[PDB]
């Protein structure tokens, strides 16, 4: 969940701070870079302001990233988190040398969990695969989640087909698939509308089918 959704984002921007929010209750801030023996969480300080209150703590936690680096992160309460309104955070080092002073709009970094319960079956109806899945667990009003299905033909084959699932739909038929080939289906998810923009979730764990002869 965390490590993964951290990974998904670390996929661009070097020494950048990346806050995001999951089920739209708690924002989560983080940044990276392993160095040497003399650091730690208590080495940095994380100050925020839900626009116009006394300042607080996107309050620190160090962890080592599987890639052999270091990650610093932290969260913020729900009721306090009232979306659309900005938030500015100030992040300083040992001594109050500042390394981030950023404004972030909670509503615009919504990051979902991957969908799940993926199920592919042949079509008792032709040369199609029929795909069913379930929305990312514990996600508020599912009815405005749009998905995108991917279709690989596999490392050895090394191919593709992509499909934009209507917002709130969890089914789709996959036509135009070669006979006798092996297809790997995976689905991902983003908040459709309105307002709140964000990022694609990870691809759901995949499911493969071997297609019958032509």
């Amino acid at each position: 969940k965390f490590e993964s959704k951290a990974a998904l984002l670390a996929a661009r921007g070097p020494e950048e701070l990346l806050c995001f929010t999951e089920r739209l209750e708690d924002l989560v801030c983080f940044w990276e870079e392993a160095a040497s023996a003399g650091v730690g969480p208590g080495n940095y300080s994380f100050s925020y302001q839900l626009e116009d209150e006394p300042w607080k703590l996107c309050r620190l936690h160090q962890a080592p990233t599987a890639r052999g680096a270091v990650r610093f992160w932290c969260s913020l309460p729900t009721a306090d988190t009232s979306s659309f309104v900005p938030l500015e955070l100030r992040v300083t080092a040992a001594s109050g040398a500042p390394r981030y002073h950023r404004v972030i709009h909670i509503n615009e970094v919504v990051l979902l969990d991957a969908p799940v319960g993926l199920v592919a079956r042949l079509a008792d109806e032709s040369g199609h695969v029929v795909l069913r899945w379930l929305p990312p667990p514990e996600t508020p009003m599912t009815s405005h989640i749009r998905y995108e299905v991917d279709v690989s033909a596999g490392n050895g084959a090394g191919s593709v087909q992509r499909v934009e699932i209507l917002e709130g739909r969890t089914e789709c038929v996959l036509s135009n698939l070669r006979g006798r080939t092996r297809y790997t289906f995976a689905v991902r998810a983003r908040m459709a509308e309105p307002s709140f923009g964000g990022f694609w979730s990870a691809w759901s764990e995949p499911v493969s089918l071997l297609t019958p002869s032509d």
Epitope: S47, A97, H101
Partner: antibody, heavy 116, light 108 residues
Amino acid sequence: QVQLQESGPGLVKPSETLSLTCTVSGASISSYYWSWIRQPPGKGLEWIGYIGGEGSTNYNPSLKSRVTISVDTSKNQFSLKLRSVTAADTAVYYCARERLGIGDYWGQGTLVTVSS
Amino acid sequence: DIQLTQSPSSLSASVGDRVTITCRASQGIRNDLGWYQQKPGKAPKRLIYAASSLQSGVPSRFSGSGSGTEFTLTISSLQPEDFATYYCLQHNTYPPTFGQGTKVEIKR
């Protein structure tokens, strides 16, 4: 309301100091962060440093060798202290409230010239 | 210190038409910028914050966009009072730094 005014303007003679203070009125200085800013007349602005009800500070590496920012809560004002004055200090000086990178609001503006 | 090189250096537009100002940074700061207005006798006022969010109080004829490395402030309809010198500021990598400072003049 958001208001700020700088005290005791005037003139300064080289390698001396400055006693600019900023009267804050409206919201409580307990919360936000405050900055001063410098500008040689027709040349450009330079940010100098911040300070909160935090006590904490930061100064531009171009003046950290000199600069000191002060904070009195009951007085509800904040002072700039600047020593080793020269002819590279002939500039306009503003106080502002860093809600982000400026402060929504700047202080009226004070001129202070430097010569013999 | 990071360098914010604005352009054009100054300008000359009629009442009405659509002025636009750019601001390039020696290193992408992405989101972390403010546009500012300096009137002659007046302490400077903050039009845009967080690259594109309009400050309260400033006219909606002022807007800003851009990300990372280049930035634009654009005055959708010029006013006579829109006379002033505008500056971009950066607070991505301390210290905060301003731009040269595009002055704009009213063709009349």
